[PDB]
Amino acid sequence: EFVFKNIDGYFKIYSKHTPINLVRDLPQGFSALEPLVDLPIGINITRFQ
């Protein structure tokens, strides 16, 4: 997953890899996401595509 946001001019991206074997839908469970890359770009971005 790629979390996109400019909060207080600080662009954060989190990740969490879980090896599971199912394709039906999103898992019914709990997960925690820890940051990997943090570039405080601070750009006035309000839309994405």
Q: Report chain breaks in the chain, C–N > 2.5 Å, as residues after which they occur.
A: none
Structure tokens at 29: 């469970």
* Smaller CB separation from a copy of itself, 27 or 35: 35
| Least distance CB 11 / a copy of itself (angstroms) | 10
x/- site string to a copy of itself, residues 10 to 49, per CB under 8 A? x-----------------------xx----xxx-------
Q: Cα(42)–Cα(39) distance, rounded to whole angstroms?
A: 9
Strand-pair category, 11-15 with 34-39: antiparallel
Which residues here bind a copy of itself, judged by CB under 8 A? 9-10, 34-35, 40-42
